[PDB]
Amino acid sequence: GGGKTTGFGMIYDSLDYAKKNEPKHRLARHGLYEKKKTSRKQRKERKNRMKKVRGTAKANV
Amino acid sequence: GKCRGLRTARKLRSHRRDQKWHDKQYKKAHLGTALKANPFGGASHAKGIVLEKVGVEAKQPNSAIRKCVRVQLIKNGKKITAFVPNDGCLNFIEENDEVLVAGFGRKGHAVGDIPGVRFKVVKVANVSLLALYKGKKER
Amino acid sequence: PVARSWVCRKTYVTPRRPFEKSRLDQELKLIGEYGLRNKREVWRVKFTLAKIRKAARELLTLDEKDPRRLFEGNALLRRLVRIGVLDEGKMKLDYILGLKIEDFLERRLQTQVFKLGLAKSIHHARVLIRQRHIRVRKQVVNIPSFIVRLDSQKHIDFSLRSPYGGGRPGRVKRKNAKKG
Amino acid sequence: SLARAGKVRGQTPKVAKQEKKKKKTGRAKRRMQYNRRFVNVVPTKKGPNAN
Amino acid sequence: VRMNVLADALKSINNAEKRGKRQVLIRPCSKVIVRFLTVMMKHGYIGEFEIIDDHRAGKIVVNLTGRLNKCGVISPRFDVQLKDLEKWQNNLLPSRQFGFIVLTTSAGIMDHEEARRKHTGGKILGFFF
RNA sequence: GAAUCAGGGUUCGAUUCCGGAGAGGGAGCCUGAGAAACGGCUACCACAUCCAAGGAAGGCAGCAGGCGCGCAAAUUACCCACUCCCGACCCGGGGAGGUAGUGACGAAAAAUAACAAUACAGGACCUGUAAUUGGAAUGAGUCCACUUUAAAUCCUUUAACGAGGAUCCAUUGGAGGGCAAGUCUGGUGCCAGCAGCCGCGGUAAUUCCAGCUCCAAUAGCGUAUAUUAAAGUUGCUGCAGUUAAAAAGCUCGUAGUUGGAUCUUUUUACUUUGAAAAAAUUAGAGUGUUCAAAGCAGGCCCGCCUGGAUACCGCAGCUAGGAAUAAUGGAAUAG
Ligand SMILES: [Mg+2]
Ligand SMILES: [Mg+2]
Ligand SMILES: [Mg+2]
Ligand SMILES: [Mg+2]
Ligand SMILES: [Mg+2]
Ligand SMILES: [Mg+2]
Ligand SMILES: [Mg+2]
Ligand SMILES: [Mg+2]
Ligand SMILES: [Mg+2]
Ligand SMILES: [Mg+2]
Ligand SMILES: [Mg+2]
Ligand SMILES: [Mg+2]
Ligand SMILES: [Mg+2]
Ligand SMILES: [Mg+2]
Ligand SMILES: [Mg+2]
């Protein structure tokens, strides 16, 4: 019927606390958090290749 | 009459379990002989291959020629006869044609004036025979 | 495993006889009087009554000083009165058995829109509900089967966004005036 | 003799249908059934498809 | 042979009732019958009954008012809890307005309306209405 | 637990919770607190994969996917944000789980018109009928934006458009009887066909094939098969057994079943009560998810108030009252 929406609000004391104890997607909605761009399918193919190589030669794989 | 005493439950329960076998609907659903004898094998439908178009004469007083097909099943190789229900739906079927058959109404019994026939064709080459009849689809 | 609920029930029982002309005409009168779309809505109200009666006939068999008869009997009576299908003078448990399904069809929103003169026909009243022109106290309701409680009987009113109650006339009336 | 098959359906003369008024559907169709049976209380029982 | 004395008592009262007789012999008198007849007599279906002592299981002469429809026994004496008592009521009694199911509880041989008041179950003897 | 259900019952429960089992078949073990582990080894059988023929590697009844089998069953999608788990851990990981797609398995809600004036019909000023007329109302759809969320999508919200044959078109089955609805018209002539059942059709078919009408239930509706009620046609409640299906040729007889009266007017059975009994489901309380299926939420002007009930849970075992009914026990060589 319109007119009324309802949500949640969370007022922090200082912004360093709000960087400290917040979900990182909620901080990323304000442009503060920068996750890296890698699909988990891309990130799991890389892991299984690293288990076939032993030693310091994992780094270039 | 019947025993009524307070400790006669075993006499009553065992006499009942023996006398359940004397009617038809319990006997055929618990021997497994009739389950061994229908070609569906306890299923509702079956796909088969039309071997032959066969003409079955109607039981008297009816005097027509009931158009049926002689079908070998894919599931178990049993050869049955299925009826082709409608005006001129034999012309949609060919030989070596893969049909879907179902029961014909009386749960394994023969129906109507067709002697020894208890099945009917539903789909003909993955197309329902009701749609070929009403012109909904084509072969 | 999943975090999903599967609790569901049906709301109607189809009658045992398919064709008796006594019952077919009897269910036709309720449709014409109350603007119902199909006979499932007659059966849903008929099924609602029968659950109340089974809850009633169970409680008539206990003695009058059992705690369960006093508790669930009174919680059944109060739920009937706050929706208006039962009078406060008739607050004994036996009077539930005298009720008809025309008392629950009287308490639809589609009925009570028309019987407050907000509509011109009971076929007209069901149309105004589905098109969001009717509100109860602050809520726009597009459900004709809304059982309106006796507490909110006064608060049935036209909507605010509606052209019938408030401003901003509908898109037919505007584009006629846009052409002129 | 499986020769004659589809005989009467083929020998039926083909009559095309008449494109006509749309039937009302839903609550309004039940409005007609309530009106045509319980508002027309003309004196007279005849069935509704009588010829 | 005679396995149940209460059954032969109530069948003989029931047969003499529909024959329209005023009095009836009840052969062997047990104390269960005497306690059964008093429950029928306090609710008033039979008149005063005379018990005859003959230095064995005696005889009872019963005056019949003409009010009885059917005095029946239930065999065997099924144990009945208070949960199940209302299911015996609409299988034995013709109405919820009259008729009685006779129980034998630990507080004595009772009709079913008294056993609800006393809040106890028992074995069922018979019924009358 | 589920479906059916007057009371009793009958049938189902592979299937998200608890418990068990097995990881192609069997067998043997290592490590460890915990395994006879299989996303650990070791054999042999079955199968199958690379190969330079010397050898090497295998276990989707994990998520997806494919083949096969069949009447019969979905995307090789996104994410650890929620729920939780593991680790040395506030940071890592999770095809557990979550979110989308396919989804007429099913369940809840609910459009496909409403009104007014005429033309008319009626009824004792009210109502009905119309391929007549009239501008009023809206969604479907299109579509910015917000919101939603891990990022999205959908719903909710709101602009922009969006209806007259409102062509933005409702089907599925029927119309002899059971059983709601035609002795309409045309064709066919025991043919083709229908028909669960009785039946219909051999030249005026109330039943076929069609058109017209009509009925039923409606975004659903036929059909096949399992099964429940109907079925007092399995009968404990509750069936029959002279002639309809049926009491053994006759008697004895052990199990089994059942046992007369009697007394205050020892062990049990019984009855009542108490405990202890996993949630979910069912019954049911409270609560306007816009209603309802649901959900356990919510409500009231710095915060405050308040719920997250109760019942039921055969039998067996335990506990305390009752002592009728029903068994049983004491003193006869008095030991
Ligand atoms: Mg294992
Ligand atoms: Mg396998
Ligand atoms: Mg192993
Ligand atoms: Mg695996
Ligand atoms: Mg499927
Ligand atoms: Mg999963
Ligand atoms: Mg549905
Ligand atoms: Mg439409
Ligand atoms: Mg019929
Ligand atoms: Mg049945
Ligand atoms: Mg019954
Ligand atoms: Mg019989
Ligand atoms: Mg005989
Ligand atoms: Mg003899
Ligand atoms: Mg005795």
UniProtKB/TrEMBL annotation, chain D:
GO terms for biological process, alphabetical: translation
Annotated Basic residues bias: 19-31
GO MF, one annotated term: structural constituent of ribosome
GO cellular component: ribonucleoprotein complex; ribosome
Alphabetized UniProt keyword annotations: Ribonucleoprotein, Ribosomal protein
Chain spans, region Disordered: 6-31
Coiled-coil segments on the chain, per record: none
Name of this protein: FAU ubiquitin like and ribosomal protein S30 fusion
Organism: Homo sapiens (Human)
